[PDB]
Design an enzyme around this catalytic site. Structure first.
Site, PDB file in Angstrom:
ATOM      1  N   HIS A   1       6.468   6.895   5.940  1.00  0.00           N
ATOM      2  CA  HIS A   1       6.005   6.506   4.623  1.00  0.00           C
ATOM      3  C   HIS A   1       5.337   7.715   4.014  1.00  0.00           C
ATOM      4  CE1 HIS A   1       2.586   6.051   7.313  1.00  0.00           C
ATOM      5  NE2 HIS A   1       1.902   6.471   6.262  1.00  0.00           N
TER       6      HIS A   1
ATOM      7  N   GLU B   1      -3.336  13.413   1.868  1.00  0.00           N
ATOM      8  CA  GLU B   1      -4.484  12.919   2.624  1.00  0.00           C
ATOM      9  C   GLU B   1      -5.146  14.108   3.299  1.00  0.00           C
ATOM     10  OE1 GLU B   1      -3.115   9.343   4.845  1.00  0.00           O
ATOM     11  OE2 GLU B   1      -4.153   8.419   3.166  1.00  0.00           O
TER      12      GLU B   1
ATOM     13  N   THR C   1      -4.911   6.350   8.929  1.00  0.00           N
ATOM     14  CA  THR C   1      -5.622   6.618   7.679  1.00  0.00           C
ATOM     15  C   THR C   1      -5.704   5.400   6.782  1.00  0.00           C
ATOM     16  OG1 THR C   1      -3.738   7.305   6.370  1.00  0.00           O
ATOM     17  CG2 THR C   1      -4.829   9.023   7.739  1.00  0.00           C
TER      18      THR C   1
ATOM     19  N   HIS D   1       0.810  -1.227   0.000  1.00  0.00           N
ATOM     20  CA  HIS D   1       0.000   0.000   0.000  1.00  0.00           C
ATOM     21  C   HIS D   1       0.836   1.266   0.000  1.00  0.00           C
ATOM     22  CE1 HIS D   1       0.030  -0.382   4.523  1.00  0.00           C
ATOM     23  NE2 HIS D   1      -0.254  -1.639   4.242  1.00  0.00           N
TER      24      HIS D   1
ATOM     25  N   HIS E   1       4.320  10.907   6.271  1.00  0.00           N
ATOM     26  CA  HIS E   1       3.900  10.572   7.619  1.00  0.00           C
ATOM     27  C   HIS E   1       5.037   9.944   8.394  1.00  0.00           C
ATOM     28  CE1 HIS E   1      -0.543  10.366   6.259  1.00  0.00           C
ATOM     29  NE2 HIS E   1      -0.114  11.597   6.477  1.00  0.00           N
TER      30      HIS E   1
ATOM     31  N   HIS F   1       2.089   9.079   1.074  1.00  0.00           N
ATOM     32  CA  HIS F   1       0.912   8.882   0.230  1.00  0.00           C
ATOM     33  C   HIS F   1       1.066   9.820  -0.929  1.00  0.00           C
ATOM     34  CE1 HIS F   1      -1.167   6.802   3.593  1.00  0.00           C
ATOM     35  NE2 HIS F   1      -0.406   7.617   4.298  1.00  0.00           N
TER      36      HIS F   1
END
Ligand SMILES: NS(=O)(=O)c1ccc(NC(=O)NS(=O)(=O)c2ccc(Cl)cc2)cn1
Ligand SMILES: [Zn+2]
Length: 256
Positions: free
Chosen positions: A90, A102, A194, A60, A115, A92
């Site tokens: 990590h 996010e 999240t 992911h 994050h 997103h």
């Protein structure tokens, strides 16, 4: 669960009913409605002794993991009581530069969001911490596309070696201080993980100042794969959850 049409964020509630909970993340940060809290302390980011170990494609995102068996890289101060240890970071990111973050700021989406995940040492380990309303502190940093971030390049260059789900690579001596912006001004609110299991255990600290990364850097993020090796290629892009209802929460600002 994932980020596809058939298993994406709008489906998560079926396996993870907390997805419709009272303190879900991310949220839109309405800058005019956030209130300055003059009693909020400056953030203390103490990453001098950080020990990075490994980078992992988990299907992911990718996680850069740290040794969190001692107080080596810690977050303190701000809204936090006590000491929070860095366990991993990590990102997103989007398929296009106009989406990927996010959190949003006055509905603006950034190209990506970093994050840095920390757990409260009074709970002894990460698995116990996620069961507590003050178990985690996640430092969120927006990425915009412009100039390269030199401190990101060591991450970018290892991604070829972890292209597919389940791949990992040694990743020692990485200094996460090279991912921080100049200012530590922030917004803070109580929220959640999240991604599933979406646990409501996070004090969110979202920095106002984005970092800039280059188009070439973010293009390399977008070459990663959600799939395992020998499976049909699905590019790891748009691995972000959209903004969730604020409900009975106030976002506080460390700055006016
Ligand atoms: N909010 S966030 O920074 O994107 C974020 C979301 C989800 C996670 N999830 C996570 O760590 N999951 S996990 O490693 O499988 C895990 C490990 C232990 C427990 Cl008890 C629960 C979940 C971490 N950070
Ligand atoms: Zn995250």
């Amino acid at each position: 669960w994932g980020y596809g049409k058939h298993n994406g964020p709008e489906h998560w509630h079926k396996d993870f009913p907390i997805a419709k909970g009272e303190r879900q993340s991310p949220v839109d940060i309405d800058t005019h409605t956030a209130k300055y809290d003059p009693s909020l302390k400056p953030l203390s980011v103490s990453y001098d002794q950080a020990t990075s170990l490994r980078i992992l494609n988990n299907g992911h995102a990718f996680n850069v993991e740290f040794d969190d068996s001692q107080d080596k890289a810690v977050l303190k101060g701000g809204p936090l009581d006590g000491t929070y240890r860095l366990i991993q970071f990590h990102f997103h990111w989007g398929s296009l530069d106009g989406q990927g973050s996010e959190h949003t700021v006055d509905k603006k989406k950034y190209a990506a969001e970093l994050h840095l995940v920390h757990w409260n040492t009074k709970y002894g380990d990460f698995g116990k911490a996620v069961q507590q309303p003050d178990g985690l502190a996640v430092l969120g940093i927006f990425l915009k596309v412009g100039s390269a971030k030199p401190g990101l390049q060591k991450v970018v260059d290892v991604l070829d070696s972890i292209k597919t789900k389940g791949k990992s690579a040694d990743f020692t001596n990485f200094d996460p201080r090279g991912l921080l912006p100049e200012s530590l001004d922030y917004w803070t609110y109580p929220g959640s993980l999240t991604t599933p299991p979406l646990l409501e255990c996070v004090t969110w600290i979202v920095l106002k100042e984005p970092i800039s990364v280059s188009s070439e850097q973010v293009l390399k993020f977008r070459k990663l794969n959600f799939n395992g090796e020998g499976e049909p290629e699905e590019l790891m892009v748009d691995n972000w959850r959209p903004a969730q209802p604020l409900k009975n929460r106030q976002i506080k600002a460390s700055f006016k």
